[model samples]
Target: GDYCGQWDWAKSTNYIVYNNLWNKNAAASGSQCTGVDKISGSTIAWHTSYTWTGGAATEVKSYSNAALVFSKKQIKNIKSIPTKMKYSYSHSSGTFVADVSYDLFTSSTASGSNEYEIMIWLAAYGGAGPISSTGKAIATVTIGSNSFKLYKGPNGSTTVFSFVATKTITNFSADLQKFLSYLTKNQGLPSSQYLITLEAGTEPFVGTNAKMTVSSFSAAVNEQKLISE
Candidate 1:
């Protein structure tokens, strides 16, 4: 069926695969499936396959990912969020991108709050890009011992900050909390805001028989010593 809905998650004691197929209307034709490969304490392997055609050139059709949840709390109350991802991509169409990345959100929509959206693009392809005011990156800062091409823009009411990797990273290891900490220190991101959700996935823009296999991943937000401001 070409209709819109998420597939059943492959559940385990500590891991689950979510096939989040949103904005299918942006794509003329596509089908995506997600599954879990393995799970150990705080580590997971997952995969997704998709093929899409004829749609907005850069609209994201699906974010097939491995997800974890936590109770919302202010950033000051949290320690460090350590995350790691190892992934690979393959495509049949040359004009396709196996976009691998993480989507992180701060605050909530309940009532009026300082809601912000942050994206860390470990990989971008097939012209996939973050919306920007001036088609240029605002700054470049190093984190995780690697330099990233930074982008800043607005997505509707939410402010978007994207860190595009200098190169395609198949093995990624970094502290996600450092990203938030930088934003808080200099970028005007509210440190008091809540980091409510975190997700890692492959957002394929346009592809045929494209696939992303996340061989290993682990992420957690733990309490860190408060940094002196």
Candidate 2:
């Protein structure tokens, strides 16, 4: 199928593509659909098409994503999280406010309950912005060759940290572990937190005739092997 229902999902060996219109009810008028175009091994190609209007400008209508399945591992025990993504956005008309990003959740326990939400925004279109306590970035730091403005805020009990790129990066490749390392070293994030999920997707606030195509994406969690005595 070229399109899927609002809550449909496609599963691959190591990922699940979700048409998660989790907040579509918040919109006054809109419709969205997503589809998994292809899959190979751990990589997936997917796309979402939507036209939305009459919503709070800051409210995200949906998060159509490809979520990686990884064993819950403490941040300190994990060796690396290497990831790559290539995507493009097409806005045919009307106001478009959206973001292409990676969303990761970590918890105190491996079972359930989110304690932290870390987001890396590779592209913020039409002036989309992340959650912030002071409506300002706490710091600007370099990862890979790009600089990101880091913002910290809270969503109920979960602390949210967002790293927004200085410019749009349609094709991205990096070691996502560097972000967790920075947090552990400088941002008061304990290494004991268990990473629960990792997802890459587009969050749309409002738009018309907007589509996002992720041509290729891959990520893997590599752990340090214990030395034999």
Candidate 3:
């Protein structure tokens, strides 16, 4: 099966380093160039400027025109996520389940101390509203104060961590809206892509491990799709 591919080789086509911020760009004016002469039919350029302070280079400005050559199949639907999304988890019974959800969009490689998080973005109606607090519940089982685990993978590899939480999310809609707004204002993401995420705790193992069962979840939508121009 064909697997996803990432950048195997990359080069900084244009770069500038300087000491004084003001004088840096002035010095590297003509030092810049454009186009990748070696790669045929390649669309790329490079520009660089820099600055310095205290006789030492402090800031650098770099611009590059680069071509990302991917296999023909790879470029198709590049903006869309794959139809299948996979989630793998192991229960205390030692039974591992890989759930496949078609609605998921992004996934992260296994990494250390970081548990995989999943988020779902929602649209707004007559301006974004707050999440609805509805599904509140009490904890059933306490897995001790430490209730998570982190495992290291191979060298130069990403690690994976896991956490269990029993807190029932009330007002899911309001919380979702809050998170959506946060992503828009802080992360520079479009509010139309509002999503709720399952976050793994930070500590290796901390918190209760009661089974969290979500009973009710719903959303109210206005007919506006922000990205659909």
The best candidate in terms of lDDT: 2
Query: lDDT score, residue 50, model 2?
Result: 89
State the RMSD for candidate 1. Answer: 3.2
Overall lDDT per candidate, in order of appearance:
0.78, 0.89, 0.21
Per-residue lDDT tens digits of candidate 1, residues 1-229? 1212456566555455688887667888878877777788899988888888887857888888777665555676678788999988888946785478888888743234547878888888876777677889888889977778778888778888888888878899999888888888878988777786688998877899887889999888886566432
Task: Tell me the TM-score of model 2.
Answer: 0.96
Off by over 4 Å in 3: 1-175, 190-210, 225-228
User: What is candidate 2's lDDT per residue for 119-169, written digit by digit as tens?
Assistant: 999999888999999999999999998899999999999999999999889
TM-score of each: 0.89, 0.96, 0.21
Give the range of the ten consecutive residues with the poorest summed lDDT in model 1.
1-10
lDDT tens digits by residue: candidate 3, 1-229: 1111111223332211111122224222222212212321222222111111122122222221122222211111123221111111122332111111101111222121322222321211112111112222211222222121111122223111111222322222232233323333543333333222221111001111211111222222222222332
Please rank every candidate by TM-score, starting with the best: 2, 1, 3
Model 1 steric clash pairs: 79-223, 79-224
List residue ranges in candidate 1 displaced over 4 A. 1-7, 11-15, 108-114, 225-229
Instruction: Score residue 198 of candidate 1 by CA lDDT.
Output: 81
Model 1 TM-score, 2 decimals: 0.89
What lDDT does candidate 2 reach at residue 187? 97
lDDT of 2: 0.89
Report the error of model 1 at residue 56, Å: 1.6
